[PDB]
Amino acid sequence: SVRQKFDHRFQPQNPLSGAQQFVAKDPQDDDDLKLCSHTMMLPTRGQLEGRMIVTAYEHGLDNVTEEAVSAVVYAVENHLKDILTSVVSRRKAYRLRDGHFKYAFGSNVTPQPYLKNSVVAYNNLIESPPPPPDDAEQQAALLLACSGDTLPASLPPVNMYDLFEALQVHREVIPTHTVYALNIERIITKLWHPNHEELQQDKVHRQRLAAKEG
């Protein structure tokens, strides 16, 4: 009975058998791409066209309508902004309009919801019927008072861990599997934090600077 036990198991289809075949063209100087990893900038409209045409060729086409270039540029910028928003949301407060539209990304207003004063201020200062400077100054002071953050603190610049957590949580900002899967692994291999010895040298250097200042 045992021998015919593992003959009908699952055989996943190798993903490379359907890999695209690569054909070599003439090596010219004019035929260049400027992938953004090489030039640390977003590609301009002209630069994008060179690679768009090159890719189109391997699929048996002639040229690009030149309205496609604009759409692709706009989409790339939009997508990058979406990812940036996802990362930002995890370390700053914000407001909501109509239930989803997030605008004010500072950490200021955020009325603490457990204060009787906050409960009263929420009903009025939020629902405004849809501003002399003295009145606005008073109300700004009130909003800062209700926030509760007596001694606010700040964060270091955005590093790898923030990106990793943001990507893991939301995950609807990269619907396509190919883009997400390949880049998440790359992100993992760039996680880093200074170890004990480096912190010791930071200690020593701080002592040195304090001394030379006195």
């Binding site: 036990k5 593992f6 198991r9 457990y114 893991q168 993992i188 996680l191 010895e197 480096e198």
Partner: protein, 534 residues
Amino acid sequence: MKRVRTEQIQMAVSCYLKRRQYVDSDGPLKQGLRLSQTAEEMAANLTVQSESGCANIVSAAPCQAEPQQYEVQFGRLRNFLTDSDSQHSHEVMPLLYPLFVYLHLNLVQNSPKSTVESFYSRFHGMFLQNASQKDVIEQLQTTQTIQDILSNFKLRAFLDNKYVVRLQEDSYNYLIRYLQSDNNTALCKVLTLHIHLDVQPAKSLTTICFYAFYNTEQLLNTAEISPDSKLLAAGFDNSCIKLWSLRSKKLKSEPHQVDVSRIHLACDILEEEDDEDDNAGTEMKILRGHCGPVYSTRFLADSSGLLSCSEDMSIRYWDLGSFTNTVLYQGHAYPVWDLDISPYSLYFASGSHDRTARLWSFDRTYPLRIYAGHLADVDCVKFHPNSNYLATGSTDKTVRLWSAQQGNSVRLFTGHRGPVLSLAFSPNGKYLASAGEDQRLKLWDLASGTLYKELRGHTDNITSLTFSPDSGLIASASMDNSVRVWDIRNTYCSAPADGSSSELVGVYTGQMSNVLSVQFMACNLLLVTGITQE
């Protein structure tokens, strides 16, 4: 269009070996012996391979053509090493002499006449007091063209050999902190090619003890016992870990301000509760903090803490001072299957659904090495007794031995008919056992990398293995709710009740449902765990 034959594989292997020039220009049937070595000769091999190249050339060297800099870099370094008033500034002082000699000698081979003289004038007056080094410092004074360096006798050994220096780890980090602070590329080139820093660390049959869990209800997943046999831990499908004290003592936590298995609102006060002596201990504790089913819990070598992995692709370290998760390792994007710790608690690795395993240190929260190469889920992992090699089982019916420090596959066994589920090394570091759904138990010979022994008799999935502290017996647990101990040592027998005859020693299938674990201890002890019903 037909399946290749067994010999054709050897034929292609030989063709590859010949093309890449690995064997002589004939049948190397003589060759094929160097499949092992001792400690000293391994050290010799690694030392020969260490000096058989340069670790960094292209990026370690400066590219701008601005000879003025060689002065500035050395001047800044001297100023920094002078005003320093540390004990490191001492230990990192000797480097200046080789630095100066080599920088000057490299200037000579490419530098217009203006620069070298200014260089010699600006710093030469600090290598005089010692006698052994005044000789060459003066000799350099009369040197312009390359023929100077080749002709002279003392310059040569410098040019064609490296200078040695000895440092502590703290001192070397002292130099690295400075080197990275600003552009010091020229010095980095000199250190890379010519100087050779050396860093070293600063200064009478057996008896079975059985355990049973009653009220689990299809939730218990795994369990383990610590080496000093004082604790018992288990994981559950509903995310949680429970701990029991085997001894007569109770478990009580100590003060701790922070706990992640708790939620506070903005209107709360952090206060250490004083109504606590009322408790004064208990026999059981619930560890909380994973958000998915748990799949492995392992103890440290000295029973100090606990480590666990879960479906939520996280690994957590539990402190037994307070029974609370205090560290969190995040290095996976898919559920983690297995976990394992090195013999003296130096490393720990983890298999995962993402087709790979990863190496970790207990003092960094990010992986250190990645062992890719399996074709599917890496279900099992085990360290070698010396903690230098790594075995991993996979659903692709294959097992790979890895080189821990370097991280490449050194062996690849085949022969299993179904996925693999367990592994075990003998404490003499000679064999490796493995079992899986096939219901066959294979011991491999690591040196030769070939099948050594095959045992049969179990009728369902084998899910655990272990050796005795003297490679005497190997115990196995199966899904048939049975525990069978085995003996491989020459002592022969005639008891062929099934396929395996002379190895099968004892069988234990008492009133017991699914089994969990099997261990061994100092003297003929074999701890078991599992659930029962009667």
